[model samples]
Target: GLSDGEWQQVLNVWGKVEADIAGHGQEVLIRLFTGHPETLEKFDKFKHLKTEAEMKASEDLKKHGTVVLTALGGILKKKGHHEAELKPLAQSHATKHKIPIKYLEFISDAIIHVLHSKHPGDFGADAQGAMTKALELFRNDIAAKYKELGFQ
Candidate 1:
């Protein structure tokens, strides 16, 4: 669980960039896929994108990215009390989609990358730590759900 101070830091940062949620989502996907190319194989629509430029220019990618961030915003709005909220998504990704859970870590890293890059100075160590904890909780909750659903 996040402390009051950590909660404020995390929420404040999200508030600052909440307006262009999709833009940040696209950037996050770009960062994730670019750094870990193998993850693209999991995405049917985005797997064909062989280059960064193609990923950046993808309408499908944009739509999917928006979906990703919108779900994330939902969890955040719940202030990380998202176990019930994340259950269906975790089960679906682990079962039907068969997505590897480690990929969430990669996406988490990409999110921090985009956040820090956008506000290099404003996003200080406290904000980074808070955001990292928040994302870690997200991954942990999903992982737990996956385990209960019989996913590795």
Candidate 2:
């Protein structure tokens, strides 16, 4: 858990920039694909969209990216209140779907990238700490869920 101040800082930062979540989401996914072209194989769709334009234009990128942001956005919403909802997302992929931790890490980094790019000034250390804690809780829940299922 985070201090009220820390939690509020995260929420305020997110609220200030919620409108751009989708855009940031797209940037995160496309950036991942670009950074690691092999990353695209997880999606049922999407190919070598090597450039920014093609990445932005791709429907698959748009959809899956939105899903990531939406899930992330939800986490920021209730803090740890939605673990029942979030655990399945992580479990579905992180375990059974065989999604690698690096991919999850990629999404985490991409989210921070979006925040930093959008609100370079507001996302100070406190805000980042809050968000980091929030992300960690969600991820820890995922790991715990997998543990409950008899895996790491």
Candidate 3:
């Protein structure tokens, strides 16, 4: 959950990010793989992209990256701490995919890395704090759903 002011800070930076979700989103995934190559094993479509150059040119990665950002946009649009937007993802990961929650945590870190590197001027300390809290809420929602499904 975020205070109104915190949401405002996040939404403000999000305006800049929303302008180019595809490119920026793709960068997030690239950063994820760059930091933790093992995470790439989880995405069948992207597992073969073993190098940064390959990932950069990957249409499949681009599509899924857009999807990832789109999901984040949906969560932000709610402007509250509701898990409805993330529940379906959590359910699939917990039951069928059995993906570790650590991947989601990595995604959060990847997001911050992309945003901070791409828009250092706009993403100041306050906005970074707000975005961190918002993403933390997303992580919590996934963890809670996993617990509910006995995936914990």
State each model's CA lDDT, in order.
Answer: 0.87, 0.73, 0.86
TM-score between model 2 and native:
0.84
lDDT of 3 by residue, 50-132 (tens): 68999999888888889989888888878865567788889988898778888889989888888889987868899899999
lDDT string, candidate 2, 116-145, tens digits: 877778678878888888777766777776
Q: By TM-score, how accurate is candidate 3? A: 0.94
The residue-level lDDT of candidate 2 at 61 comes to 74
List of clashing residue pairs for candidate 2: none
Q: Write the per-residue lDDT of candidate 1 for residues 31-91, one digit (tens) a residue.
A: 9999999898988878899989998889888888889998987897788778788988898
* RMSD to true structure for each model, in Å: 1.1, 2.2, 1.2
In order of appearance, the predictions have TM-scores of 0.95, 0.84, 0.94
* lDDT for position 107 in model 1: 94
- Positional deviation of residue 47's Cα in model 1 after best superposition, in angstroms: 1.0
Error of 3 at 23 (Å): 0.5
